[PDB]
């Protein structure tokens, strides 16, 4: 089958003008092809998670139609986490569709440090809040000895994100795990958008290293 770039970014990506996935997320690139996430971490691929296989029914004249919906927490412990959801007639099609979506929306986690600094980022940089549906999760920085103390499901998301230590606080119908994992992901997704006092020196914006201007 091989790979044929259906995306201009994909053509540049195989061409090697862009090295690393971070530079795409710097230039706020929409990512449509899963092949760009797999190609950025090819060896041993990366960990994925089967979560909440579900059986929704839409009523029709004869009766309800059963379609399986699954949610996947693709992530590796480097600060990249993606949660995505896919619904299909069979479980096998749904897990593959959700996995593709989860890989597509891999996002950078700021990670960061507590009061102590040594050289290993071990916690979320600042308390992080995300609301999905009715659940709001608060990801608070933790001491290095303390681990990920969280709901069994959101614990995995923060582990597949390389956040070794976190303080969690989930409020709402957390039992609705699809919303619960989304809130943790939403908090993590906008960790770079929050501006810290360290990002206060203005710099660059030169166009030369932009991956959008890059014409192969």
């Amino acid at each position: 089958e091989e790979w044929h770039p259906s995306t201009k970014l994909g053509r540049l990506v195989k061409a090697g003008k862009i090295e690393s996935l971070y530079d795409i997320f710097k230039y706020s690139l929409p990512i449509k092809e899963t092949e760009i996430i797999d190609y950025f971490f090819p060896k041993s691929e990366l960990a994925e998670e089967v979560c909440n296989i579900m059986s929704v029914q839409k009523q029709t004249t004869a009766g309800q139609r059963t379609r399986f919906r699954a949610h996947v927490i693709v992530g590796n412990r480097d600060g990249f986490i993606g949660y995505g959801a896919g619904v299909s007639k069979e479980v096998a099609n749904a897990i593959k569709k959700a996995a593709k979506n989860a890989r597509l929306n891999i996002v950078p986690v700021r990670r960061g440090f507590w009061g102590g600094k040594l050289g290993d980022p071990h916690t979320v940089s600042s308390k992080l809040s995300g609301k999905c549906g009715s659940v709001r999760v608060r990801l608070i920085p933790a001491p290095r000895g303390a681990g990920i103390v969280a709901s069994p499901t959101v614990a995995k998301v923060l582990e597949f994100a390389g956040v070794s230590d976190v303080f969690t606080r989930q409020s709402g119908h957390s039992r609705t795990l699809m919303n619960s994992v989304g809130a943790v992901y939403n908090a993590l997704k906008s960790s770079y958008s929050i501006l810290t006092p360290d990002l206060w020196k203005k710099e660059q914006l030169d166009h030369v290293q932009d991956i959008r201007t890059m014409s192969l």
Binding site: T7, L9, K32
Partner: protein, 196 residues
């Protein structure tokens, strides 16, 4: 400040606009006629066309710039601009999904957008948001600036203004580059840009 252009612009009516004025466009309008028509200041239009031209010149691949117009009156003009310049065109209906559906028949990933009418070309502006396309817009006096980087205030309705504005932009982008020299006249005639 081109004196020759302002006499032509006065006949083209790029100085005139709709009676509704948005707060964002208030700066450009000099005043109004008693009947309620609004008089865009002509030199702001010049210092806008040239500003857009400076941004447009940065796009090294000419066809990366994509122009869209469902407005039949301006359809000849966007194409004429594209032929004299080398920008790509999306005339007539937008065939929604062009910007974000990879398998769309006209699927493009432009680096810049030229929307003839912010209201008439509404779908393209929302789609440009999903795929990081900054957009330039020809606008009237009542123009919402939602998802518009830069906007050029022209009559954006009369055929003569709509065609002339594109001629001014095309000449400006080429004049900034090489093509027609900055001082000599363009061989291309403003009239062939306007649709009848």
């Amino acid at each position: 400040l081109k004196e020759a252009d302002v006499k032509k612009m006065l006949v083209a009516t790029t100085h005139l606009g709709v009676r509704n004025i948005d707060r964002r466009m208030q700066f450009y309008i000099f005043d109004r006629q008693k009947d309620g028509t609004f008089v865009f200041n002509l030199q702001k239009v010049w210092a806008k066309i040239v500003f857009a031209a400076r941004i447009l010149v940065t796009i090294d691949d000419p066809a990366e710039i994509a122009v869209v117009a469902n407005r039949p009156d301006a359809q000849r003009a966007i194409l004429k601009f594209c032929k004299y310049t080398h920008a790509t065109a999306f005339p007539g209906r937008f065939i929604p999904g062009n910007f974000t559906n990879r398998m769309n028949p006209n699927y493009c990933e432009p680096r810049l957008l030229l929307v003839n009418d912010p209201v008439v070309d509404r779908q393209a502006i929302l789609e440009a948001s999903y795929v990081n396309i900054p957009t330039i817009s020809l606008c009237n006096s009542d123009a919402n600036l939602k998802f518009i980087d830069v906007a050029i205030p022209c009559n954006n309705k009369t055929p003569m203004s709509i065609g002339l504005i594109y001629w001014l932009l095309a000449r400006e982008v080429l004049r900034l580059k090489g093509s027609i020299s900055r001082t000599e006249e363009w061989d291309v005639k403003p009239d062939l840009f306007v649709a009848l």
